[PDB]
From a paper:
Mitoribosomes are specific ribosomes found in mitochondria, which have been shown to be remarkably diverse across eukaryotic lineages. In plants, they possess unique features, including additional rRNA domains stabilized by plant-specific proteins. Among these, the [name] ribosome (called mitoribosome hereafter) is an essential molecular machine that synthesizes proteins within the organelle. We used cryo-electron microscopy to provide a high-resolution structural characterization of the cauliflower mitoribosome, in translating and maturation states.
We produce a sub-3 Å cryo-EM structure of the cauliflower mitoribosome, which reveals details about rRNA modifications and r-proteins, particularly 4 distinct plant-specific PPR proteins. Given the high local resolution for the different parts of the ribosome (up to 1.8 Å locally, permitting to place ions and solvent molecules), we adopted an unbiased approach to rebuild and identify ribosomal proteins. Beyond these PPR proteins that are specific to plants, it also revealed the presence of a herein identified r-protein. This protein is an isoform of [name], that we name [name], interacting with both the remodeled domain III and mL101. In angiosperms, the [name] harbors a large extension at the tip of the SSU’s head, rooting from h39 of domain 3’M. Here, we resolve this specific domain to approximate 4 Å (compared to the previously reported 8 Å). This allowed the unambiguous identification of the two r-proteins located there (rPPR6 and rPPR8). mS80 (rPPR6) is positioned at the base of the head extension, whereas mS81 (rPPR8) wraps around and follows the shape of the head extension. Most remarkably, we could identify that the mRNA channel exit harbors mS77, another plant-specific PPR protein. It wraps around the SSU body, rooting from the SSU protuberance, where it is anchored and extends in the back of the SSU, close to the mRNA exit channel, where its PPR domain is located. Finally, the improved resolution reveals the contacts between the LSU’s CP to SSU head via [name], [name] and [name], and unravels the presence of ATP in mS29, as also found in human mitoribosomes. Our cryo-EM map resolution allowed us to identify in total 18 rRNA modifications, 6 in SSU and 12 in LSU.
Author numbering:
A (entry chain f): 33 to 204
B (entry chain C): 17 to 266, 280 to 362
C (entry chain A): 107 to 205
D (entry chain D): 70 to 263, 295 to 517
E (entry chain e): 139 to 384
F (entry chain U): 2 to 48
The structure:
């Protein structure tokens, strides 16, 4: 159709010789993940894993922000309208993408070139390679919004040395 | 006339009985063909003129002295594939393929003399094209001689091809004296029945079965057999190593396991053995597109011919200069 | 390198008799700033990789045949550092095999 | 084999068995009433089952005429196998090569059963593993083909179709890989004498190394030696240099590759002028190919045409290119190149078209494995510049894999779309 | 413990003694692989006699599609085999004795003396013409399997070839029985004259893609719709919107 | 020869097509590929 021209702009693809890069380009929301963005990302990564002409995949972000987490305003307005189905579908799509990232058959590399919050770490930290820069800032302020560090953040924070996972998940 | 074409083509393209003198000539002709094949590295005209002219001559002889170059030049196509596939649907060619007759000139004489029917109507057009659905038969007063000659062709075919060269590689004169006794047995229906039900032909059949099995190893058949059965072949070695560890850390079992593993390793790793003895050339049956009932005899066309199943004795590398076929896919390409 | 199986004859004290290598090298490491030898041309002719230090004024015909360029001025200290790093890496990999 | 007396025995037994069955059926009928008009004069004189009696009379007459040697072999009639021309020494060397490997294998399995210590048992197990992984190792492609054949015997319908096509492709690839592997020394020859090659090269390598150490030591002791001893060391060094030169000559054996066809493109007489007259030599241009995408060429000059062809034949395997083909029968797209003043056009064609080319282009395209290409040589038809333009054209084709890597995008055949 | 080793040796001996069997079924599968769809086995005359019995007994259950699936041949060959067996029994009823079949049993008992090529299913011959499309950079999507597309092409060509065979074979069958003239001196006028077969031309007379609508117009002044034979005549003379397969 | 590309890609295509036997250095180059830098447009700036 023609209505998905905004989603294809929100999740761009750059192709190289044997590799593909997914780029987050939602500068209004600081690259916050919506349901169509997660659906497109899941479709792209499934097709790239199936393709034997692609060696490894990438995930980048455009702007000063890598990914500011999930776009919760749409879920808030959906919960205000009574039905809870939209939030549900967004959540199993996001956790399905995180599970795909954790079990991915080819190498995957994330370039973290800015602020990473919430599920932004959840789509990248289960990957095989992770590149951090001097602009990379990682925080988990889910307790200060009334929510919990989901999207696999209870997997990798709990495996940090000592009790640093608790400090990060409680203080943000 | 026709034996002299062997001197032109340096091999037995004539298909009648050779004398002693003609066999002595063929020895020298095949020596010439061997010395020419070694000489091909230093020949500028080998591909474009020599091999192509010899292949075209062989194809003309194969289809009953037809002008193959002229008729193919009538079409504007470079490759011979559609031309040869169209030739296989001719009425005289099909009458040769069904083994209702022995040569193309016999078939042309029978069709021209108004003695073969297509869909119960007499058709005297030797170049007629038969499409799928056509029914071929003979005349009612003609079919009994055709049945007798078809039986004679098949039984003297087994006696003159499958018995002379398969394990009875006898010298010429004593085999010619021996053929009288073999011909007397075919005089009766009881003799043909008893030759069919005999342990002689059963041993010949079993040896040819084993011989056809051995030729499959040139394609790496035994390696595919090992690849199918990799897990249990490994499990045999796991069992041997487990037994030789457990029952040794503190002997018929060891000898039995060693004999089994060595038998399996020999059966799966032995290379293909191409022996000195020449392969017997077998009569082909056109069952991919022609359905035959040899009792009357009658036949029905139900499909189209195949470019890889035309029974010419031309090598693939020579004939590829005319066909230009991507061989190996099974298609008419 | 391209004619390494050619015969050689002893003459005198001379400039000393040396034969070519018995095995063809799998790599050539070159320190030829003034291009006094035909090493890069013969190695490119024989499909052998070349590790060399490249000056700013290297010709395109020589630069095209250098598989592993190292852009530097070939000072004594840099050649020492280059060779020390090469030596240490080679013998650290070689000690990992029992050798 | 089967004795001819055994054949006479079995045919006489068959005729006897015919007579015994006839008399037994005659007895069974005649005891139960049943007159035997269908037994007498219906299996004896008026059977005529094949119409073979005139052939018997014709053969009987031709067997009582001439004399020769009755057991003399002659030339066969249905001979001309024509693919039975392979050098038998390599094949009878394969047999005892496999036999020596198998005997070594049997010896290690018998040594594994003769151990007493599990440290020794583990050591001989690792020796067996290193032997089997180097001499009795099955290629992984055959494991893929075996798994696919396992799925195929229980497949039906669309799956049976698709698996048959996939295994057809795999069998073609493994046959090609086994026939044209450069790592197998069985895929090489000698050329006319101008693991056995492995060890005969290793012994010469060790001899050359020993001679080089000896030469270095003698040059070392020559540097400090003056007088007649210096001359004696000089003569000793010259003898060592002669030995090393001869041993270096002995390693230069040119090899040809099996499964390749080599063809002459051009043999020319060239000339040079001196004060004594014209000096005439021959140049030979030749091409080679394995019909599977590998093509090469060489040009040589010698005193005679035969010698020039021989030098080019020895040189022809030293510059081999790999050419990508589309579906093993044509080029991916239309290509136009020029080398000097020779312009070459090549056009891809569908699968029943054929090769439309002049002899130089046709020979090179045939040896590279193409089947359906149209071509045109425009301008100069210098055969050597034509060869070079053909190689320039075939290396400038951009395959769908090349486009896919160059642009970072998926390239699809249009009929699969 | 040693009983486990004995069962392991039994598991090894049941395989090693049956290696030659596995090589035999592998040879048949190799015949099917190297020529895709080739059935690798040769169909015997006794199997065709059994096919004729199963068709004559229960034609509603043992149909052409079922007999083709069971004996792994094409439906065209099933129709041909059934016609030839019908003719064989008509000839043996006219003769009074069963026909001689020496050639058939020589072919049945010793198939290894001969080469056969009898096919199971149809594989289409593709013009492997290079023609490519570059997808967009952000294309998510799955390329089709070329074996799947080859299967669909082959099945379409199989359906076409089957119906063309059916039409030509039924026409030749009732030419064999004697309902088609085919000889110019057997085409004679009736006592009232000639029947005609009148086709309606133009866009307003079309019966569909294939030609115009037809009626008969008898010599007595009456007209009638087409018969079944006349319907076959209509169907066989239509233009076909394809190139010639085989 | 007439093949295009650098040493690595040309050697990969030759080895894959079974034209040349695999050299010893081919795996060492594939493990540590020669370095690549972006296009620079050739305008060197005065420091
Ligand atoms: Mg001119």
């Amino acid at each position: 159709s023609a209505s998905d021209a905004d989603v294809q702009d929100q999740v761009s693809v750059e192709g190289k010789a044997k590799s593909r890069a997914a780029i987050l380009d939602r500068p209004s929301s600081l690259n916050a993940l919506s349901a169509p963005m997660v659906g497109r990302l899941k479709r792209l990564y499934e097709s790239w894993e199936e393709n034997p002409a692609i060696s490894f995949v990438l995930m980048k972000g455009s702007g000063k922000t890598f990914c500011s987490g999930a776009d919760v305003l749409p879920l808030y307005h959906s919960i205000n309208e009574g039905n809870t189905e939209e939030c549900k579908h967004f959540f199993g799509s996001l956790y399905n993408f995180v599970y795909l990232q954790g079990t991915y058959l080819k190498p995957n590399i994330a370039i973290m070139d800015g602020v990473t919050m919430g599920c932004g770490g959840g789509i990248s930290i289960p990957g095989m390679f992770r590149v951090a820069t001097d602009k990379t800032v990682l925080a988990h302020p889910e307790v200060q919004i009334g929510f919990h560090p989901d999207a696999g953040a209870s997997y990798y924070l709990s495996r940090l040395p000592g009790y640093l996972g608790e400090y990060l998940a409680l203080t943000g | 006339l026709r034996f002299q074409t062997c001197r032109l083509l340096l091999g037995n393209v004539w298909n009648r009985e050779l004398t002693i003198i003609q066999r002595r000539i063929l020895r020298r002709l095949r020596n010439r063909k061997r010395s020419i094949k070694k000489r091909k590295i230093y020949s500028k005209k080998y591909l474009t003129s020599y091999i192509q002219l010899q292949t075209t001559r062989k194809l003309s002889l194969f289809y009953g002295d037809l002008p193959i170059t002229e008729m193919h030049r009538g079409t504007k196509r470079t490759s011979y594939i559609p031309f040869l596939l169209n030739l296989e649907t001719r009425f005289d060619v099909i009458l040769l393929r069904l083994h209702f007759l022995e040569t193309i000139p016999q078939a042309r004489q029978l069709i021209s003399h108004r003695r073969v029917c297509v869909n119960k109507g007499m058709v005297s057009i030797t170049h007629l094209k038969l499409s799928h659905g056509d029914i071929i038969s003979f005349q009612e007063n003609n079919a009994i001689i055709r049945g007798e000659e078809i039986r004679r062709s098949f039984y003297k075919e087994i006696l003159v091809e499958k018995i002379i060269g398969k394990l009875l590689h006898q010298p010429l004169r004593m085999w010619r004296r021996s053929k009288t006794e073999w011909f007397h047995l075919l005089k009766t229906k009881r003799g043909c029945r008893l030759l069919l039900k005999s342990r002689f032909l059963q041993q010949l059949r079993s040896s040819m079965q084993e011989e056809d099995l051995e030729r499959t190893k040139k394609f790496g058949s035994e390696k595919v057999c090992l690849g199918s059965s990799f897990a249990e072949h490994k499990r045999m070695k796991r069992n041997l190593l487990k037994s030789l560890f457990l029952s040794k850390r503190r002997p018929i079992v060891y000898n039995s396991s060693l004999s089994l593993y060595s038998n399996s390793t020999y059966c799966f790793a032995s290379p293909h053995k191409l022996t000195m003895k020449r392969r017997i050339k077998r009569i082909e049956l056109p069952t991919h597109y022609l359905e035959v009932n040899y009792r009357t005899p009658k036949a029905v066309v139900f499909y189209g011919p195949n470019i890889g199943h035309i029974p010419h004795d031309i090598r693939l590398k020579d004939l590829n200069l005319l066909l230009w076929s991507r061989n190996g896919r099974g298609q008419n390409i | 390198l391209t004619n390494s199986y050619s015969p050689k004859k002893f003459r005198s004290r001379h400039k000393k008799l040396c034969f070519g290598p018995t095995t063809m090298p799998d790599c050539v490491v070159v320190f030829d700033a003034e291009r006094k030898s035909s090493v890069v041309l013969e190695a490119a002719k024989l499909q052998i990789p070349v590790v060399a230090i490249v000056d700013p004024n290297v010709p395109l015909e020589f630069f095209e045949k250098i598989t592993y360029p190292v852009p530097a001025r070939d000072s004594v200290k840099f050649v020492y550092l280059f060779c020390n790093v090469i030596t240490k890496c080679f013998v650290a990999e070689q000690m990992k095999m029992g050798i | 084999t089967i004795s001819p007396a055994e054949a006479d025995r079995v045919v006489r037994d068959l005729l006897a068995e015919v007579e015994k069955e006839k008399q037994r059926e005659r007895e069974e009928r005649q005891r139960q009433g049943l007159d035997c008009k269908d037994i007498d004069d219906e299996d004896e004189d008026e059977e005529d089952y094949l119409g073979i009696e005139p052939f018997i009379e014709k053969l009987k007459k031709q067997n009582l005429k001439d004399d020769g040697e009755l057991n003399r072999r002659e030339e066969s009639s249905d001979s001309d196998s024509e693919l039975d021309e392979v050098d038998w020494d390599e094949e009878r060397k394969k047999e005892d090569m496999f036999n020596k490997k198998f005997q070594r294998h049997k010896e290690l399995l018998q040594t594994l059963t003769k151990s007493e210590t599990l440290d020794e048992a583990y050591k001989w197990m690792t020796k067996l593993d290193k032997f089997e992984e180097k001499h009795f190792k099955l290629a992984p492609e055959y494991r893929v083909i075996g798994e696919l054949m396992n799925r195929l015997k229980v497949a039906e319908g669309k799956d049976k179709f698709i698996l048959q096509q996939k295994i057809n492709r795999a069998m073609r690839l493994v046959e090609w890989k086994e026939a044209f592997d450069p790592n197998n020394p069985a895929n090489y020859g000698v050329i006319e004498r101008d693991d056995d090659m492995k060890e005969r090269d290793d012994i010469l390598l060790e001899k050359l190394n020993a001679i080089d150490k000896k030469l270095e030591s003698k040059l070392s002791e020559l540097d400090h030696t003056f007088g007649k001893k210096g001359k004696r060391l000089e003569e000793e060094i010259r003898d060592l240099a002669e030995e090393r030169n001869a041993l270096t000559e002995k390693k230069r054996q040119p090899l040809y590759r099996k499964g390749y066809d080599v063809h002459v493109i051009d043999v020319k007489k060239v000339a040079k002028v001196t004060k004594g007259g014209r000096v005439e030599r021959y140049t030979a241009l030749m091409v080679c190919g394995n019909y599977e995408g590998v093509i090469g060429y060489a040009k040589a000059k010698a005193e005679t045409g035969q010698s020039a062809m021989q030098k080019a034949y020895e040189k022809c395997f030293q510059n081999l290119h790999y050419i990508e083909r589309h579906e093993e029968h044509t080029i991916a797209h239309a290509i136009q190149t020029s080398y000097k003043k020779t312009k070459l056009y090549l056009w891809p064609a569908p699968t029943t078209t054929g090769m439309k080319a002049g002899r130089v282009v046709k020979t090179m395209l045939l040896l590279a494995g193409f089947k359906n290409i149209k071509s045109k040589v425009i301008g100069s038809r210098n055969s050597y510049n034509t060869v070079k333009a053909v190689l320039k054209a075939l290396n400038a084709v951009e395959t769908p894999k090349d486009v896919q890597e160059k642009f970072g995008r998926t390239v699809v055949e249009k009929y699969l779309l | 413990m040693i009983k486990e080793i004995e069962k392991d040796n039994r598991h090894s001996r049941v395989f090693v003694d049956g290696i030659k069997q596995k090589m035999m079924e592998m040879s048949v599968l190799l015949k099917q692989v190297k020529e895709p769809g080739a059935r690798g086995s040769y169909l015997k005359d006794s199997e065709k006699t059994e096919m004729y019995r199963l068709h004559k007994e229960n034609p509603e259950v043992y149909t052409v599609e079922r007999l083709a699936k069971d004996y792994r041949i094409m439906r065209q060959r099933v129709h041909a085999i059934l016609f030839l067996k019908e003719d064989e029994e008509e000839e043996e009823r006219k003769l009074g004795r069963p026909l001689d079949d020496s050639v058939e049993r020589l072919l049945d008992e010793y198939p290894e003396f001969f080469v056969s090529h009898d096919r199971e299913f149809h594989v289409a011959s593709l013009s492997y013409k290079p023609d490519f499309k570059v997808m967009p950079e952000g294309w998510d999507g799955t390329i089709k399997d070329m074996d799947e597309v080859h299967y669909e092409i082959s099945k379409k060509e199989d359906d076409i070839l089957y119906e063309e065979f059916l039409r030509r074979f039924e026409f030749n069958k009732l030419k064999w029985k004697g309902e088609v003239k085919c000889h110019k001196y057997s085409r004679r006028r009736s006592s009232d004259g000639w029947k005609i077969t009148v086709e309606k031309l133009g866009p307003q007379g079309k019966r569909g893609n294939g030609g115009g609508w037809k009626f008969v117009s008898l010599p007595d002044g009456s007209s009638r719709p087409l018969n079944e034979v006349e319907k076959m005549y209509v169907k066989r003379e239509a233009p076909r919107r394809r190139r010639k397969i085989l | 020869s007439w093949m295009k590309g650098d040493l690595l890609s040309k050697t990969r295509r030759l080895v894959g097509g079974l034209a040349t036997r695999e050299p010893v250095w081919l795996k060492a180059m594939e493990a540590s590929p020669p370095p690549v830098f972006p296009r620079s447009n050739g305008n060197l700036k005065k420091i």
